[PDB]
Amino acid sequence: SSRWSKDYDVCVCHSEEDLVAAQDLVSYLEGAIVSELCQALSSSHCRVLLITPGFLQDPWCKYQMLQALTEAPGAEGCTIPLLSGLSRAAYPPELRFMYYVDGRGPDGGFRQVKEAVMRYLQTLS
Amino acid sequence: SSRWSKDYDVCVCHSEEDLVAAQDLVSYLEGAIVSELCQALSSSHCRVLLITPGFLQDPWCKYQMLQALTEAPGAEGCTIPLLSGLSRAAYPPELRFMYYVDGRGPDGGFRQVKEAVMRYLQTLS
């Protein structure tokens, strides 16, 4: 519950193919919000899933997405799916019943992602 | 932990399109194992996901699969994915890092599913 219970406020879970976009999101988020690219030993309050064509094709990415949602946004943790570079028709069906940010929104979805992160940080002590 | 902590030993989570196959699995499982088709108020020790073309296309099915795995086979609960009537190339990428039963196995995968269920029941008091 403590804002300091975790070293980072948000990390970006991405596939190698989208390194650049992920770095821009991290940059956008930090402009305070502490951000980084997600990694094995990475632990933050919020986790952004950069769901792209490369992400959906990668078995490890999909499994990570699964674990990200395993213990997260049901309503407890903070997992933010960001659909980027994908046709809506190719979106994972389950998202229809879940919260997510569309990449066609303002700032490629970056703005709503940052907002979602802040909303969650405000609920911390 | 108690074998009686739940009224059913296993329910079959399926899409309307596969009612028949689901009923045969339920029949096969019971031949003791108490089985039924999963429903809203349904709660059992094991949950079998009848992942078919219709299942993967259905947003609610996918969301249910997500919740089924939300609090389940990470290693705690009992969720058994049964891939039936699908080309391996169309399998959800995440399964590569997960346990699942292929429908091309003995008895359309029914045998290994039943075995998985029994293995789990034996760990109960």
Instruction: List the domain range (segments joined by +) for residue A66.
Output: 1-125
Does the CA dihedral A55-A57-A60-A66 come out positive or negative? positive
> Which of B55, B56, B63 to probe by mutation at the A interface, max A CB count within 10 Å?
B63
Residue type, B87: S
**CATH code (residue B98):** 3.40.50.10140
Please tell me if residue A91 touches chain B, with a CB cutoff of 8 Å.
no
Say if the Cβ atoms of A93 and B65 lie within 8 Å: no
Closest Cβ opposite residue A97 in set B59, B74, B95 = B59
Enter the tokens of residue B106.
């003995």
Q: What is the DSSP letter of A85?
A: S
On chain B, the residues whose CB falls within 8 A of the CB of A61 are: 93
Residue type, B19: L
Domain count, chain B: 1
Say if the Cβ atoms of A63 and B92 lie within 8 Å: no
Report CA A18 to chain centroid distance, whole Å: 13
Closest Cβ opposite residue A63 in set B62, B66, B97 = B97
